[PDB]
Amino acid sequence: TAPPDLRVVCHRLASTPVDSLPRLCPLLINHVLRCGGPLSEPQTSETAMLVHKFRTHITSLLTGKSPAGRFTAVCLIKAVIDVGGWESLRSAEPWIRGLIGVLQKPDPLSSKELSIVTLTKLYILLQDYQTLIREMATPTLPGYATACLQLIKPPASGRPLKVPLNFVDTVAWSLSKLVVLYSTTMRPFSGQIKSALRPYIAPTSSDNVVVPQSLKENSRNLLILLTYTAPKNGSSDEWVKAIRATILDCHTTADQVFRAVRESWESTTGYHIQPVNATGEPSGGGDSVDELPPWSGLQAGAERLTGLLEYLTAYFNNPTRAPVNVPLGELLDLTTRLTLVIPPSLGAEDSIETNPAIGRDEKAELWSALPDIHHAVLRLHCAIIRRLEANAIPLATDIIDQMVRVSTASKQLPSVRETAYILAKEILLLAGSTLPKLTVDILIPLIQSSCHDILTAAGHASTASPVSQAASALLPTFFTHLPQKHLPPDIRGLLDRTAILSHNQSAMLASCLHPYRDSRGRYYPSILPFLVRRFPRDESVEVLRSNLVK
Amino acid sequence: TAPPDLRVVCHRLASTPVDSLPRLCPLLINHVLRCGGPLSEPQTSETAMLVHKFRTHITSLLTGKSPAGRFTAVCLIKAVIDVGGWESLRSAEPWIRGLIGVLQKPDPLSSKELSIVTLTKLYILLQDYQTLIREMATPTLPGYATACLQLIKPPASGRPLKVPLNFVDTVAWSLSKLVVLYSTTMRPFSGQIKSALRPYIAPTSSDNVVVPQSLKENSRNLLILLTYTAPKNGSSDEWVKAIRATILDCHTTADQVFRAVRESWESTTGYHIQPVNATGEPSGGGDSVDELPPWSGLQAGAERLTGLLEYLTAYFNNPTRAPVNVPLGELLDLTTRLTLVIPPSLGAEDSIETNPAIGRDEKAELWSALPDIHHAVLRLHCAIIRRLEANAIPLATDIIDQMVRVSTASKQLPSVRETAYILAKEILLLAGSTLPKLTVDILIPLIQSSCHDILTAAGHASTASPVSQAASALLPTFFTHLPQKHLPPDIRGLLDRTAILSHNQSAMLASCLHPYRDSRGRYYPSILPFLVRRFPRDESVEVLRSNLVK
Amino acid sequence: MLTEEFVSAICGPPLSSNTAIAKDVGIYCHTLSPSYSVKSTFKKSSVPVNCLAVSDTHIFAGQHEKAYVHVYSRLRGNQEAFVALPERIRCLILIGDILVVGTTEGRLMLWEICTGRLVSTPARHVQAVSCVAATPSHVLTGSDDSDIHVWSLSQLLELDSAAEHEPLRTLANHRAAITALAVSPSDSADTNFCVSASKDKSCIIWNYQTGDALRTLIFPGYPLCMSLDPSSRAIFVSCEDSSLYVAEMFGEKPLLGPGSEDPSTVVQISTPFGATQPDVGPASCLSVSYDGTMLLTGHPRGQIMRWDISENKSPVELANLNAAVTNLIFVSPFLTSKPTKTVNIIKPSQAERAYTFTAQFEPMSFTKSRLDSLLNATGFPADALESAIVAFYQP
Amino acid sequence: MLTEEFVSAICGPPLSSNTAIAKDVGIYCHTLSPSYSVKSTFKKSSVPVNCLAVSDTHIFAGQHEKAYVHVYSRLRGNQEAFVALPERIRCLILIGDILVVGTTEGRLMLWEICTGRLVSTPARHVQAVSCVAATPSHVLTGSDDSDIHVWSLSQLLELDSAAEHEPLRTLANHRAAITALAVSPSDSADTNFCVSASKDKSCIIWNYQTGDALRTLIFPGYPLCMSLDPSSRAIFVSCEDSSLYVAEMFGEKPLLGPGSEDPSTVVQISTPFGATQPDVGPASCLSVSYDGTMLLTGHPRGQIMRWDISENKSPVELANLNAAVTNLIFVSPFLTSKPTKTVNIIKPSQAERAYTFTAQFEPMSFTKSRLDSLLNATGFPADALESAIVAFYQP
C-alpha cells in the first residue's frame, strides 16, 4: 500500500505534459515533501516500484531535451534531497552532473538559479557523510565551479556581461557557501573570483552600472571568505593583510574626500596624510588588480569610502577559519578621523576651517556627503560591538564621543538618528551602568531627541517609523543601564511621561524597578498605577504589583 | 543662503544628461528628503529662485520625451510630495496629469508602477485637505481609473494580457487604496473591475495561468471593498450578499469535491446536499458574471475551494464602510462540513464509508487534497478570531474540536501543525483559562506534539523551522492560559523540560508564576534556579528580584 | 497632562424646587481635568445604584423599579434605545459587548449587544441580585441572601448549550445582604482576589477561583461602596456613618502576603480617612481616578465631592445636581484600539435565526505588501529603487 | 543527555603514599552527574585557594609560592602557557576573557588574554588581597586590611588611560581580614548586593553600588568559604568549627526584603545545617551545582563531600584525591553561544603596539540573504517557486 501522495505524483508525472509540468510543480513539491517514508526507505512492494519509477522519471526529465522538464527535474531533485535523507543523497550521482549540465546548456535564468540552489544544498548535505564528499562532491565540484565562473566571467573588455547581476549574486552566494567547506578543491579558482568580484565591492557613480545591494554584500562576503583557500594555513595572514589594506584604502580615499577640510586629526598608528593637489576634481583609483576600479568626483569618492566602510563591516559580519589579529587600534583611529570632520549648523561654514582653493560647489557636495560616511562609520561600530561583545568595553568611551558628535552634527537626518539610537542601545547595554556624570550629561540630547521622536510617533507632541522603533527599543535602556543619580529630574520626568504616553510596557517596568534619587532625598512617585491600569493581566506587572507595593 | 543639498540637486540636474539620471536617482531624492524645509515654505532669495528652477526642471522632465527623464521625474514628484507638504500638494496640479500621461505613453512598466504608487500617495495626501479634492482630485480621478482599467482589461479570449500580473496586482492595490477614499467617483468603474479581477479570485490548475498570491489577495480585497461604492447606502447589503454567495459557492464546490465520500454532516442553517453525478471527473463553475471561471478535476476543485476559503478570510481581513451582518452560523456550518472529512490512519481505507462507483485514483487524490482545505479552514478561523476577540468566545468550543480533529488527522504535516499551534495560541489567549477537563484531555496531544517539535529543533529529542517557532510562541501560553489543576503531571513535566532545554525565558517565568499543584496540595519546585542561571540579567529575573528594590 | 472625564447619573425627584439645572436631565458627562465643566447631557433616565455602564460608543442606564434599560449613543448625543427586559433590573455592568444584568428575581442575564442574544440563568439566588462584577473569564453575583455565586463566562455564553447553567462555587461566609463587590485586575488562579462588602459590617477578601476566604475586615458601619486603588494597595470604603475609610492591604502590616496573620483572625478598621457632615450624608457611590491620586464621591443631596488622597486635604464640592448621585463612572483618558466598533445595537429577541454578529470593521492593516512599504516610506526604499532602475534599464 | 562537570585543583605534597594516585597531577576534571568519573587530568600544578579559573577553552591556575600562572587548554588537553606575573598571586578569577589577579602587595592586574594587555592598579590595599569577585561592570576586592574596594571595570580598562586608577567606594565596617566575597548576578542599582565573610565571625550583605550595609550575620566561627545559591535565596557558608551553615534571606524571619528588620540589627546564626568529622576537616572550598540542590565541599585532608540539601544532612564522600583539594569549580552543562573563540592566548607584554584583538570568528549567521530562505526551507518557498515559474514562462 503506497502513499496516496506517491500515487498522485506518479500519475500526474505520467499524464501531465512536460510543457505544463512547471505549472504543476507547486503541488508536486508538496506531495514529495509529504512522501517522507518510501523515499527514505533503502533498497517487491508497490512503494518500491513507484519510488523507482519516480526516480527514473526524474532522471528522464533531467536528461531530456525539454527545458520545462529540466526545471521540473530541478524542483523534484531539491524536494527529494530535502525529504529522502541519505538514500536520496547516495542515489544522486547522475543528478549532480545533470544539474551542472542545466547550468551549462542555454536554459533560462530561473532554472539556472534553482539548479545552483539545489547543488549548493547537495554539497552542504554531503558534509555530514565523510565518504560521499570523496566519491561524489570532490570530482563533480570543479566542473560546477568552472561553469559558474564561465557564467559570471566577463566575455570581453568591449562587451557587457551576459548574465544579470542578480544571477551573479546567486553565483557569489553559492561560492560563499562552498568555500568554507571545500577550500582545497576550489583553491585554484580563487584567482578568477577575485577578478570577477572586483567591480562589485565598492561601486561608485562613475562605474555607470547599478550594482545590486545583495550582490555587493555577497561579493564582500566571498572575497573575505576566500582566505580559507590560502595554502600552508595562510588564512590569518591573508585576512590581516587584506583588512589592513582596506584600512589603508579608506585613508587614501578619505584624503581625496577631505582635501577641502583642514584636519586637526593625528594618528596613533602613525599614518600621515599625503598632500593632495588643489587643482582639478578629486580623483582616486587605478586599473591595477589589487586596487579597486577608478572613480572620479568628490561624491563618487564618498560612495567609495562608504563601500569600503561597509566592506570593513562585512569583515566583522563574516567568520574566520583561524584566530586572526584584528587591528582595533587602526579601526578606531580611522573612525576617529572620519568622525572628527562634521557638518556645521546654519552659518557655521565660516567657523569650520576650509581650504581656500576649494570651490563652494565642491564644499557643498562635501557637506552633503559627510552624513552617509558618518552613518557607515556608526554601522561599522555596531558590527564591532556585536562581534566583540564585552571586548569593546576598552573602546566604549571613544564610540560614545563619536556617536554624540555625529548625532549633534546631524540631528535632522532620521537615518542618522535611528543608527545613533541602535548604537546607543548596544553601548549602554555593554558598559552603561558605570558611565560618569560628564558622559551622562553629554548623552542628554540623545535622550531628548529619542523622547521627542517617540512622542511625535505616538501623536502626543504620525505612524510607525524605523526611528520610532529604534527609540522605543532604546527607551527601557535609559532606566535599566544608566545612572539614575546623574540624571536631572526633568530628564527622568520626560522619560516617565514618554513611557506612559507611548504605553511602553518594558520601559514602564524598568521605571518602576528603578526609582529616581534626587539630592534632597524625597521619594518621587512611581508610574505603577498607569502600568497596572494599562496592562493589568501581564505576569511581570503582577509581580511588580505584589512586590513593590509591599 | 541655499541649502547645500538643494544646491547639489540643482547642480546635478543641470549638469547631468537625461539618460544617466535614473542611475543617479537614489542620490537626488536622498538630498530632496534632506531638504524638507525650503520646499515646505510657501511661494527673490537664492533659495526661492532655486526652488523655482527645481520645480521647472521637474516639470520639464515630466513633459519631456525621454523615458529616463520621465522616470527621474516620477521619483522626484514622489520625493517632493513626501517632504513638501501643503504647498507642494497645491502646486502639484499639472504633475497629476503628467503622471496620467506617463501611464498613457508606452513607457517601461517599472516607471508605470512608480507612477501608480506616486499617484496613490498624491490622492491619499489630497484626502486630508477638502478644497484640494474638488480642485484637482475629482476631475483627474476618472482618467487615472480609465488608464488603469485599459491597462488591465483583457483584450480578447485568444489574446493574452500584455502587462504582467505583477502590474495587474499593482493596479488592483492602487484601486483598493482609492475606493475607500472615493466611492462615488469609482462607482461608474466598479463594473469593469469585477470583470477584470474575476479570474484571479480563486484560480485553478485548469486555467493554465499562474496567478500571484499578491494579485489574489489584492483582487479579493478590491472586490470586497467595492461595496463602498454601493449607491443609496447599500454597502452592508452587498457585503452580506457577497459573503453569503461565497459560502454557497464553497458548499457547491464541496459537493463536487466530496462526491467520493458520504457526509454525516447535517446543516443547522438550511443547506441540503444535492446529488452529484458519479460519472466522469468532477467539474464546476461557469461563464456567468456571478460565477467564477470553470474548473474540471478534483485537484482543481480543491484549489477552487481553498481560494474561496481565502476569499472568505479576506472579508475579515478587510474593513467595512457600514455595520454589517456576519453569518457566523453559516461559517461554522461550512467549517464543520469541511473538517468532518478527515485523513485516515495508515491501512484504514475501509474505515470511512466511500462510494463504490468512484475510482481509487480519485479517492487517493481527494484524501491528499484534504489537508490543504483543513489548513485554509484553520486560517479562516484565525482571521475570525483576530477580528472578533472576546465576541468569538461562543465560537470557542467548535473551533477547538475542529482544530483537534484536523491536527489528529494530519499530525504528520508541519504546515498543518504550525497553523494548529497559531490557532491554539489564539483560542487559549481568548477563552483558554476556563476550559474543562475534557477539553484539556483532548488538547493534550497537541501539547505533546508542540513539545516534541521544540525538543527536536533544540536537539534534545539545526535551524528553527516555522512549526518550531509557532510551538515556541505557544509554549508560554500552555502555562499562562491553561488550567493546571486538570493537567496530568507528566504533561507538566514535559512542558518544564521543554522550557528548560529550549531556553524559553517567557515559559520559565510562566512556569514559576503558575505552579503545579499535586493531589496532595503541595506545590512543585520552581524552575527559577535554571532561569536565573540561563538569563541572569534579563527583565524576566529583574522583575522577580523586585522585593529588594526598597 | 491628561484629560479625564466622568459620567454621573441622578435618581429620584429633584430635592430643591428652583435651580439652574434642568429637572428633566438625568445623565451628566463632565471633564475633570484640567477644568470642571459639563461636556454633555442625556435626557431622561432614573438610574438606581450600580445600574450604569459606559463604553466608548454607548451608555446603558437601568431604570428605577422598571424592566427598562435606556441606551444612549455617546457618538451621536441622543437616545438610541429603550430596551425592555423580562425582569426588572437591580444591577447591570458591561464587559466587552455583553451587558450582565442581575435582576430582582434572583436571575443573571447576559445581553450580547452586537448579536441580540439574551441568555438567562436559572434562579440560583433566592432574593434580588444586589451587585455584580465581571472578569474576562468569570462573573460574580452577590445577592441579598448573603450569597455570592461565581459563574464561568464561556459556559454562560455557549451557543447551543441548552443545559441549565450552574455556578462553579458559592462564596457564603457573609450573614447579610451583599452591598458591594470589587475584583483584582489579575485573573490567574493563585494571584487574584475579590473583595465583598455586606450589611454585617464586614468585607471579605476571597480567592474566587479556589473559594478560600483570605481576609475578614470589620467596619463600624456597614459598607455602601468600595473602590480599589489602581495599584491594588488600598480599598476605599464608604460606610453608613458618613465616613470613608482606607484599608491598606499590603502596608506596614500585610493583610495578604507572607507576613499576614491567619485568615480566620479578623482585622478591624476604625480610623476614618474622611468624614462628611450630616447634611451631606453618606456617599452613595465611590470612584477613583486613572492616576489614583484623586477620588470622587456621589452624595444623595446632589453634590459631587473631590478628595485628594495624596495630599490628604479637605474635600471640595464640584457642583450640585439637585438629585441623588447614584452612579459615577470614570472614563479612561487613553483610547484602546478595539477591533470592531459597535455603532448600533440589536434589541434582545428570542427567535430561530443564524448567529449574526453586527459591528463595523476598522482599518488597522491586517494585510501587508511591498507596495504598502513604498507608500508609507518617505520616498522609496533603496532596494525597491534599485530594482526599479534595473528593470527600467533592462531591454 | 545533560552531564554536569566540575574541575578540581589540589595543592601541596601528597599526604599518603599511594602509587595509584599520581603525585604530579594537580588538576582533575570530573563528572558529578550521572555518577563520579574522572574525565581528564592536568599536570604539575600546586594551586592554592581562589587561584583557579575555568572557561570553556582554558583553565587558569595560579601557582603557590611562584609568581606564575599555568594555562591549560581544555580543547587540546595540554599545558599551553607558562605566564609570569610581576608580583605574587594570592587570588585569581576570570570575567569574560579578562583575568583579575589580586596580589600580596595589594595590587590588582587586569590581563586581557586575547589582546595581551596588562593593567596594574595602584596598591590601594595596604596588605594582601584575599578575595575578589566580578560582574561585567564591577570588581570587588576584599583584602586583609579589613577593606573591600569597589572598582569600575570600564574605568579600569581603557585605551590610552594614564590616570591612576581609584576605587569608587570602600566598605570598611568589618574589623578583620576579609575571607570571602560573593556577588548577586543582578547589575541593577537597586536590586544588586554582595555578601562578605571576614575573620571577625561576621558576614555583611552590602549594596556595593550605593555603599549601604543591608544585613549583618554573626556565626560561632569565622567563615572560610561562601557561595550563594543560584536563585539568590540562600547563602551556604563553611566555618572553622567544621560546620556548614545555611541562611535563607526570605524565610519566616527574613534577612532581606520588606518584612526584614532594621540594618543596624545583627542576626545571630547558631543552628548548623551540617558538620564534618575532624578526620575529614573543615571545608576549604565550596561550590554549588547548576540546579542548586547539591553542593560540593573540598577539605584539606583530600576528601570531596557531596551535600544533598533536601535529601541527606550528612555528606557523601565522592573520592579522595590524596592532596588538599583547594578548588572546586562547576561547569554549566549547557553550551553557550559566544561570538568569538579563544583558541590561543597572547602573553602579557609591555611594549608600544596598536590595539590588536586575537580570536577566532565563529559562524553566527549575522548576514541574512533571500537565497538562504530557499536553501534552509524544505523544498522551495511558494513565492520563490512562483517567481521562478513566472520568469521561466516569460521570455
mmCIF file of C-alpha atoms in Angstrom, chain D residues 156-352:
data_model
loop_
_atom_site.group_PDB
_atom_site.id
_atom_site.type_symbol
_atom_site.label_atom_id
_atom_site.label_comp_id
_atom_site.label_asym_id
_atom_site.label_seq_id
_atom_site.Cartn_x
_atom_site.Cartn_y
_atom_site.Cartn_z
ATOM 1 C CA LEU D 156 39.912 50.279 34.985
ATOM 2 C CA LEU D 157 40.353 49.175 31.368
ATOM 3 C CA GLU D 158 40.514 51.852 28.638
ATOM 4 C CA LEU D 159 42.758 52.737 25.719
ATOM 5 C CA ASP D 160 45.471 55.336 26.433
ATOM 6 C CA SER D 161 44.487 55.659 30.098
ATOM 7 C CA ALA D 162 47.248 57.277 32.154
ATOM 8 C CA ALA D 163 45.391 58.448 35.271
ATOM 9 C CA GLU D 164 45.951 56.360 38.385
ATOM 10 C CA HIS D 165 43.035 54.009 38.982
ATOM 11 C CA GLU D 166 40.918 54.698 42.074
ATOM 12 C CA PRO D 167 38.122 52.614 43.638
ATOM 13 C CA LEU D 168 34.628 54.078 43.517
ATOM 14 C CA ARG D 169 33.705 53.112 47.090
ATOM 15 C CA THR D 170 35.218 51.444 50.147
ATOM 16 C CA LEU D 171 33.221 49.288 52.572
ATOM 17 C CA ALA D 172 35.031 49.088 55.920
ATOM 18 C CA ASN D 173 32.535 48.233 58.655
ATOM 19 C CA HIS D 174 34.397 44.948 59.089
ATOM 20 C CA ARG D 175 37.141 44.698 61.715
ATOM 21 C CA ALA D 176 39.158 41.706 60.449
ATOM 22 C CA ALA D 177 40.627 40.240 57.276
ATOM 23 C CA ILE D 178 38.056 39.566 54.554
ATOM 24 C CA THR D 179 37.845 35.847 53.813
ATOM 25 C CA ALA D 180 35.195 35.512 51.112
ATOM 26 C CA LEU D 181 33.136 37.606 48.702
ATOM 27 C CA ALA D 182 30.095 36.692 46.631
ATOM 28 C CA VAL D 183 28.051 38.962 44.354
ATOM 29 C CA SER D 184 24.482 38.577 43.096
ATOM 30 C CA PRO D 185 24.272 38.336 39.270
ATOM 31 C CA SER D 186 21.962 41.380 39.074
ATOM 32 C CA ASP D 187 23.608 44.581 37.847
ATOM 33 C CA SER D 188 20.681 46.893 38.678
ATOM 34 C CA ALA D 189 21.413 49.754 41.070
ATOM 35 C CA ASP D 190 18.509 48.860 43.371
ATOM 36 C CA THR D 191 18.487 45.032 43.396
ATOM 37 C CA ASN D 192 22.202 44.146 43.412
ATOM 38 C CA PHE D 193 24.025 43.010 46.532
ATOM 39 C CA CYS D 194 27.196 41.324 47.721
ATOM 40 C CA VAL D 195 27.817 39.154 50.780
ATOM 41 C CA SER D 196 31.196 39.219 52.525
ATOM 42 C CA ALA D 197 32.717 36.916 55.146
ATOM 43 C CA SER D 198 35.548 38.052 57.394
ATOM 44 C CA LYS D 199 37.644 36.653 60.240
ATOM 45 C CA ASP D 200 35.579 38.533 62.851
ATOM 46 C CA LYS D 201 32.910 35.772 62.629
ATOM 47 C CA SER D 202 30.733 38.140 60.594
ATOM 48 C CA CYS D 203 29.112 38.262 57.169
ATOM 49 C CA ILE D 204 27.738 41.546 55.831
ATOM 50 C CA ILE D 205 25.284 41.937 52.953
ATOM 51 C CA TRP D 206 26.093 45.184 51.127
ATOM 52 C CA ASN D 207 24.690 47.219 48.269
ATOM 53 C CA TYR D 208 28.081 47.740 46.629
ATOM 54 C CA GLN D 209 26.761 50.255 44.065
ATOM 55 C CA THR D 210 25.246 52.519 46.747
ATOM 56 C CA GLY D 211 27.609 51.628 49.612
ATOM 57 C CA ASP D 212 24.934 50.606 52.121
ATOM 58 C CA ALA D 213 25.128 47.701 54.570
ATOM 59 C CA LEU D 214 21.935 45.673 54.250
ATOM 60 C CA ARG D 215 22.454 42.935 56.812
ATOM 61 C CA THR D 216 24.895 41.666 59.443
ATOM 62 C CA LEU D 217 25.099 37.992 60.457
ATOM 63 C CA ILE D 218 27.323 36.541 63.191
ATOM 64 C CA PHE D 219 28.492 32.895 63.242
ATOM 65 C CA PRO D 220 30.203 30.964 66.077
ATOM 66 C CA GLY D 221 33.319 30.588 63.914
ATOM 67 C CA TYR D 222 34.885 32.686 61.195
ATOM 68 C CA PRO D 223 33.719 31.640 57.707
ATOM 69 C CA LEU D 224 36.351 30.071 55.463
ATOM 70 C CA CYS D 225 34.281 29.817 52.281
ATOM 71 C CA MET D 226 30.967 31.056 50.893
ATOM 72 C CA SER D 227 28.623 30.520 47.987
ATOM 73 C CA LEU D 228 25.199 31.888 47.161
ATOM 74 C CA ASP D 229 22.570 29.557 45.795
ATOM 75 C CA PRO D 230 21.842 30.171 42.072
ATOM 76 C CA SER D 231 18.366 31.591 42.673
ATOM 77 C CA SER D 232 19.756 34.069 45.284
ATOM 78 C CA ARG D 233 17.543 32.602 48.031
ATOM 79 C CA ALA D 234 20.216 31.445 50.479
ATOM 80 C CA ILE D 235 23.882 31.565 51.465
ATOM 81 C CA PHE D 236 25.892 28.402 52.151
ATOM 82 C CA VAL D 237 28.935 29.061 54.344
ATOM 83 C CA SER D 238 31.528 26.824 55.936
ATOM 84 C CA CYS D 239 33.114 27.596 59.294
ATOM 85 C CA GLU D 240 36.238 26.773 61.276
ATOM 86 C CA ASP D 241 34.119 24.605 63.584
ATOM 87 C CA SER D 242 33.856 22.142 60.618
ATOM 88 C CA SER D 243 30.206 23.211 60.299
ATOM 89 C CA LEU D 244 28.110 24.092 57.255
ATOM 90 C CA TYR D 245 25.530 26.847 57.773
ATOM 91 C CA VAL D 246 22.571 27.780 55.576
ATOM 92 C CA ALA D 247 20.998 31.245 55.664
ATOM 93 C CA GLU D 248 17.771 31.907 53.751
ATOM 94 C CA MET D 249 17.006 35.557 53.042
ATOM 95 C CA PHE D 250 13.251 35.073 52.588
ATOM 96 C CA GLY D 251 12.183 32.754 55.404
ATOM 97 C CA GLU D 252 9.659 33.324 58.160
ATOM 98 C CA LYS D 253 12.238 35.700 59.631
ATOM 99 C CA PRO D 254 13.640 37.386 56.505
ATOM 100 C CA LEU D 255 17.164 38.780 56.348
ATOM 101 C CA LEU D 256 16.221 40.978 53.377
ATOM 102 C CA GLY D 257 13.017 42.223 51.807
ATOM 103 C CA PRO D 258 10.021 44.212 53.051
ATOM 104 C CA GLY D 259 9.484 42.078 56.150
ATOM 105 C CA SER D 260 13.130 42.356 57.179
ATOM 106 C CA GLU D 261 14.217 44.240 60.284
ATOM 107 C CA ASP D 262 16.500 47.253 60.573
ATOM 108 C CA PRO D 263 20.000 47.056 59.028
ATOM 109 C CA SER D 264 21.508 48.021 62.394
ATOM 110 C CA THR D 265 20.062 44.843 63.909
ATOM 111 C CA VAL D 266 22.534 41.944 63.821
ATOM 112 C CA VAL D 267 21.281 38.378 63.327
ATOM 113 C CA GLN D 268 22.823 35.512 65.305
ATOM 114 C CA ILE D 269 23.096 32.189 63.465
ATOM 115 C CA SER D 270 23.847 29.176 65.667
ATOM 116 C CA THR D 271 21.951 26.299 64.018
ATOM 117 C CA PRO D 272 24.265 24.266 61.748
ATOM 118 C CA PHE D 273 22.868 22.542 58.670
ATOM 119 C CA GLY D 274 25.763 20.081 58.620
ATOM 120 C CA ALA D 275 29.007 19.100 60.297
ATOM 121 C CA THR D 276 32.116 17.216 59.182
ATOM 122 C CA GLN D 277 34.228 14.929 61.350
ATOM 123 C CA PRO D 278 37.684 16.321 62.263
ATOM 124 C CA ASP D 279 39.392 13.488 60.362
ATOM 125 C CA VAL D 280 37.809 14.997 57.239
ATOM 126 C CA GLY D 281 38.464 18.606 58.235
ATOM 127 C CA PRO D 282 36.723 21.924 57.602
ATOM 128 C CA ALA D 283 35.504 22.696 54.090
ATOM 129 C CA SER D 284 38.395 24.534 52.447
ATOM 130 C CA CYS D 285 36.363 25.256 49.294
ATOM 131 C CA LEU D 286 32.691 25.078 48.302
ATOM 132 C CA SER D 287 30.711 25.116 45.054
ATOM 133 C CA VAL D 288 27.008 24.810 44.207
ATOM 134 C CA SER D 289 25.536 22.697 41.405
ATOM 135 C CA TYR D 290 23.577 24.007 38.425
ATOM 136 C CA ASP D 291 20.176 23.100 39.879
ATOM 137 C CA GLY D 292 21.310 24.242 43.330
ATOM 138 C CA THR D 293 20.141 21.043 45.031
ATOM 139 C CA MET D 294 23.703 19.773 45.537
ATOM 140 C CA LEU D 295 26.878 21.422 46.823
ATOM 141 C CA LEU D 296 30.458 20.123 46.766
ATOM 142 C CA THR D 297 32.907 20.850 49.592
ATOM 143 C CA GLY D 298 36.652 20.267 49.364
ATOM 144 C CA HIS D 299 38.653 19.554 52.521
ATOM 145 C CA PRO D 300 42.443 19.827 53.013
ATOM 146 C CA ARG D 301 42.622 16.154 54.064
ATOM 147 C CA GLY D 302 41.783 15.129 50.483
ATOM 148 C CA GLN D 303 38.115 14.122 50.600
ATOM 149 C CA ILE D 304 35.328 15.545 48.442
ATOM 150 C CA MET D 305 31.880 15.738 50.061
ATOM 151 C CA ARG D 306 28.607 15.980 48.175
ATOM 152 C CA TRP D 307 25.758 17.516 50.178
ATOM 153 C CA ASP D 308 22.141 16.956 49.170
ATOM 154 C CA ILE D 309 20.285 19.793 50.897
ATOM 155 C CA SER D 310 16.828 18.239 50.548
ATOM 156 C CA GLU D 311 17.755 14.582 50.975
ATOM 157 C CA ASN D 312 20.656 13.968 53.366
ATOM 158 C CA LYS D 313 22.137 16.234 56.028
ATOM 159 C CA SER D 314 25.214 14.016 56.289
ATOM 160 C CA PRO D 315 27.653 14.427 53.372
ATOM 161 C CA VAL D 316 28.586 11.625 50.970
ATOM 162 C CA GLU D 317 32.228 11.025 50.021
ATOM 163 C CA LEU D 318 32.876 11.000 46.285
ATOM 164 C CA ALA D 319 36.618 10.258 46.339
ATOM 165 C CA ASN D 320 39.959 11.111 47.919
ATOM 166 C CA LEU D 321 42.434 12.900 45.654
ATOM 167 C CA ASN D 322 45.356 12.314 48.111
ATOM 168 C CA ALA D 323 46.046 16.073 48.360
ATOM 169 C CA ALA D 324 44.440 19.211 49.756
ATOM 170 C CA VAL D 325 41.540 19.949 47.400
ATOM 171 C CA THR D 326 41.782 23.731 47.317
ATOM 172 C CA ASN D 327 39.477 24.475 44.369
ATOM 173 C CA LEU D 328 36.182 23.076 43.074
ATOM 174 C CA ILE D 329 34.529 24.878 40.144
ATOM 175 C CA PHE D 330 31.322 23.723 38.471
ATOM 176 C CA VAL D 331 30.811 23.929 34.698
ATOM 177 C CA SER D 332 27.444 24.618 33.086
ATOM 178 C CA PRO D 333 26.014 21.583 31.231
ATOM 179 C CA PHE D 334 24.559 23.836 28.507
ATOM 180 C CA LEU D 335 26.639 25.144 25.621
ATOM 181 C CA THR D 336 26.585 28.938 25.385
ATOM 182 C CA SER D 337 26.910 30.635 22.007
ATOM 183 C CA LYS D 338 29.856 33.037 22.202
ATOM 184 C CA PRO D 339 30.689 35.077 19.073
ATOM 185 C CA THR D 340 34.468 34.593 19.440
ATOM 186 C CA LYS D 341 36.580 31.575 20.372
ATOM 187 C CA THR D 342 39.827 31.997 22.315
ATOM 188 C CA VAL D 343 41.977 29.219 20.886
ATOM 189 C CA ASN D 344 45.385 30.697 21.768
ATOM 190 C CA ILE D 345 46.303 33.231 24.442
ATOM 191 C CA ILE D 346 48.588 36.244 23.980
ATOM 192 C CA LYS D 347 51.124 36.506 26.791
ATOM 193 C CA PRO D 348 51.302 39.708 28.875
ATOM 194 C CA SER D 349 53.803 42.191 27.476
ATOM 195 C CA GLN D 350 54.771 45.832 27.989
ATOM 196 C CA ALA D 351 55.602 47.430 24.637
ATOM 197 C CA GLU D 352 54.237 50.009 22.207
#
